[PDB]
Amino acid sequence: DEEAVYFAHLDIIW
Amino acid sequence: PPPCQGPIEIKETFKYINTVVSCLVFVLGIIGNSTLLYIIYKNKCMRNGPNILIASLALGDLLHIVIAIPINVYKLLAEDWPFGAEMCKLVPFIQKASVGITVLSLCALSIDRYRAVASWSRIKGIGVPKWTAVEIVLIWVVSVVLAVPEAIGFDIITMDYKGSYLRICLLHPVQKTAFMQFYATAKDWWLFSFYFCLPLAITAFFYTLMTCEMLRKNIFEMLRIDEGLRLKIYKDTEGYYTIGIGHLLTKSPSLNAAKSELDKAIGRNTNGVITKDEAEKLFNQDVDAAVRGILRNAKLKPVYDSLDAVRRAALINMVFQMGETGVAGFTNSLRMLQQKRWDEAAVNLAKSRWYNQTPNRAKRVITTFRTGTWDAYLNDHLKQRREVAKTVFCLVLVFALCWLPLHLARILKLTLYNQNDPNRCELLSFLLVLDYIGINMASLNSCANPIALYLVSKRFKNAFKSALC
Ligand SMILES: CCCCCCCC/C=C\CCCCCCCC(=O)OC[C@H](O)CO
Ligand SMILES: CCCCCCCC/C=C\CCCCCCCC(=O)OC[C@H](O)CO
Ligand SMILES: CCCCCCCC/C=C\CCCCCCCC(=O)OC[C@H](O)CO
């Protein structure tokens, strides 16, 4: 799930 | 595994609008929470139990606004994590700690105000109770203990996304221990169940129990004003010994026998004199007995079931004065009350002998039917209970609204994201803007708590004007 770890790179911290 | 028609991205137009919003929430949150903590510290009339729990709520929000907005604003604009692995563990730990402080202080405030209704001294919020200090230290300790899994599980990932070097501060997908490997799976449900569903369910429960006891005190004040409170044994219009709010003791002509009936009813040797709290407990039993007879009465039960709480009190008021039979004789006015035809019923009831013989009491009860409020019986104690109920209702309403978007954005990510779809990547671009809006909203709770207290509390409104003068 590498499109997911890029999501967490752009996403907020929560 | 399947590819996607586009790169997960956020429009620069969005990044500039949201950042302006995040700047306003931060400045208003710091000012509002600091002044709120300032007026609670300065003014000595506001140094009580319930306000101390509010200060714990204010500090938790002041702590959250400090570590949430300034780092998510940077994460939006700079798109990288340059703070090392210590801040990657420290920031989410303090975040979940501060959030836990606010939801538990909210829960403690709802429990405290429910227990305070029974005593007039407590509902005024006078002084600081004993276990107030140890409750706060438990709230903060339990908050940081539950935030511990957030600290150890976070780390910096270094990966390759289409030839780009990425420093990603995140919760590591694979953990050493088995418990932490399980925490990473259902973390969003733990946040949704414990930091939203449980506080809303706990506060709504104790708020409901509080207003139910407030309802019983409204009716007692209503009947005390209309019928009268007698704390010494007296004879009614028929010569029978009576106490309290129209409570018949016995039909015996022996005052001494009547005194023993009183002692049986109060559970105390009263010598003919009872206290206001004993008359109230005796009155609450008379209401429950009156309601049981109404619900067993075929002509009053349908009307009573359809009425709201305030208007049910007005009907109980009439039964206390005239009895079940005499009230059931108002066959037409009762019909209009069941059809919610207030003004017509108000006009019809004013034609009665009841209105002609006791016009003052009748006007008050009719106004209660017409409006459905306690405006005809507004008194000193009702206002205090009314101010308390408004205070906790707005604080939990501000909480639920401010934390709904962020909690919503995480629960639809769990249930609608399917990594096998080809077009799923660009719905995260819509979740990207929701998760950043949900950060501004949850931070608005820090700003909306002082605004709510300013609008519902006369003392907070004046203390706020004093600090900004
Ligand atoms: C609509 C939701 C339905 C309700 C579901 C959620 C409410 C759970 C209630 C209690 C469990 C948590 C207890 C928290 C601590 C209780 C402290 C306490 O018991 O206070 C003493 C007071 O005298 C008591 O009347
Ligand atoms: C310009 C100054 C203000 C002027 C405005 C006047 C104030 C309105 C007050 C009550 C509304 C009365 C209607 C009540 C609405 C609820 C519907 C109802 O059923 O009540 C009437 C009853 O049904 C009859 O049979
Ligand atoms: C002619 C009029 C016909 C009908 C008149 C209806 C108009 C409502 C007026 C007074 C309601 C009094 C309620 C004041 C608040 C008491 C309840 C409370 O304190 O609860 C917190 C509240 O939910 C915080 O939003």
Author numbering:
A (entry chain B): 8 to 21
B (entry chain A): 87 to 303, 1000 to 1159, 311 to 402
What's the paper's own text on this?
The stimulation of the ETA receptor by ET-1 leads to potent and long-lasting vasoconstriction, whereas that of the ETB receptor induces nitric oxide-mediated vasorelaxation.
IRL1620 completely lacks the N-terminal region, and consists of only the α-helical and C-terminal regions. The consequent cluster of negative charges on the N-terminal end of IRL1620 (succinyl group, D8, E9, and E10) reportedly has an essential role in IRL1620 binding to the ETB receptor. This cluster electrostatically complements the positively charged ETB receptor pocket, which includes K3466.58 and R357ECL3. Moreover, this negative cluster probably stabilizes the α-helical conformation of IRL1620, by forming a hydrogen-bonding cap at the N-terminally exposed amines. Nevertheless, the N-terminal side of the α-helical region of IRL1620 is less visualized in the electron density, suggesting its higher flexibility as compared to those of ET-1 and ET-3, probably due to the lack of the N-terminal region. However, the extent of the inward motion of TM6-7 is smaller by about 1 Å in the IRL1620-bound structure, as compared with that in the ET-3-bound structure, due to the different ligand architectures between IRL1620 and ET-3. Overall, the downward motions of the W3366.48 and N3787.45 side chains are only moderate, as compared to those in the ET-3-bound structure, and the hydrogen-bonding network involving D1472.50, W3366.48, and N3787.45 is partially preserved in the IRL1620-bound structure.
